[PDB]
Design a protein around this ligand. Structure first.
Ligand code: GNP
Ligand code: MG
Lengths: 170, 166
């Protein structure tokens, strides 16, 4: 079999959206910060025995340009909603991303995964339980990741594909 | 102008001269912000724009540069410290040639700046406009062609020399 999924990576600036994506696509960790405007990637993977093409849209962490960002959300089938475990503001921003996705998709059931990135760092400010509780209240998975060590990177993207597939089954 | 300084950038493409862009800096209306750009253009404080890159060029919108500290689009510093406050929003992003401060939110002006190649009115009230291209808009239009949709440039566009005129 083969299928294809449009994945969109969203979240506040500097949380590691690009570093997570670049680990998945290019298998290296970018230590320098290169702020995103917009980037797109394609990769063929096998998830649960089912081959698929991932189209990943790496978006900029910013709340300006609502109409452009709404178009990303209309076209996207699932969303990785990323915060950094050492940036409380980025965690507090998550509910705004979920609200925008639901409004644009006109649905309360949109494939989404909550990603707590930078778990390698010793400067945590957001507790795992806090993030788990938020994800539970949304009915979505929570994955802790480190783009630096690659921990959880495949899991985050593959889990999102699983969420899309479960949504398509309804 | 009898009041507003004129500064110039000699633009280079992979080291080769492209041409000169001069700017009127609106010290009459935006004095602190104009003075920062003037001083960074002369290098008189011991640091400034000479050698730095236009790291983000998006056709239809703007050419952005001015990171002379990190050299990667994340840096910059003013003559007043790392950051200074938004001085005023008297002037707007009315069209091509407008020179305005880049920032990372309220009161974070440093050295990064952008030159508009179109009206960018959604930036009004959030970025401080402080100057305009005087001569060499054709050179800015030539720079714009090295950009791309995400701002990455296909050749390295730099300020090979800069200073104050008149
Ligand atoms: N230690 C550590 N640093 C990380 C991790 N992920 C990203 N970083 C660092 O955090 C900075 C920002 O990462 P980046 O992926 O560019 O963030 P972004 O969310 O894409 N930013 P933007 O919204 O501006 O495009 C970079 O210096 C990067 O190396 C991680 O898991 N661990
Ligand atoms: Mg990014």
């Amino acid at each position: 079999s083969m299928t294809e999924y449009k994945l969109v990576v969203v979240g506040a600036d500097g949380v590691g959206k690009s570093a997570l994506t670049i680990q998945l696509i290019q298998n290296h960790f970018v230590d320098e910060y290169d702020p995103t405007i917009e980037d797109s990637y394609r990769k063929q993977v096998v998830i649960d025995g089912e081959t698929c093409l991932l189209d990943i849209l790496d978006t900029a962490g910013q709340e300006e340009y609502s109409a452009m960002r709404d178009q990303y959300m209309r076209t996207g089938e699932g969303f990785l909603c990323v915060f950094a475990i050492n940036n409380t503001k980025s965690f507090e921003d998550i509910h705004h991303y979920r609200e925008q996705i639901k409004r644009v998709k006109d649905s309360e059931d949109v494939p989404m995964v909550l990603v707590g990135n930078k778990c390698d760092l010793p400067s945590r400010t957001v507790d795992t339980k806090q993030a788990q509780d938020l994800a539970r209240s949304y009915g979505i998975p929570f994955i802790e990741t480190s783009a630096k060590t690659r921990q959880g990177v495949d899991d985050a993207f593959y889990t999102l594909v699983r969420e899309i597939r479960k949504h398509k089954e309804k | 102008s009898m009041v507003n300084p004129t500064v110039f950038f000699d633009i280079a493409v992979d080291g080769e001269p492209l041409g000169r862009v001069s700017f009127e800096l609106f010290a009459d209306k935006v004095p602190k912000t104009a003075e920062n750009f003037r001083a960074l253009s002369t290098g008189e404080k011991g640091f400034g724009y000479k050698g730095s890159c236009f790291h983000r060029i998006i056709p239809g919108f703007m050419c952005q540069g001015g990171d002379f500290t990190r050299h990667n689009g994340t840096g910059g510093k003013s003559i007043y410290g790392e950051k200074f406050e938004d001085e005023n929003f008297i002037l707007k992003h009315t069209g091509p040639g407008i020179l305005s401060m880049a920032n990372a939110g309220p009161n974070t002006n440093g050295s990064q700046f952008f030159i508009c190649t179109a009206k960018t009115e959604w930036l009004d009230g959030k970025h401080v406009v402080f100057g305009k291209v005087k001569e060499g808009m054709n050179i800015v239009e030539a720079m714009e062609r090295f950009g791309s949709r995400n701002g990455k440039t296909s050749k390295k566009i730099t300020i090979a020399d800069c200073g104050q005129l008149e």
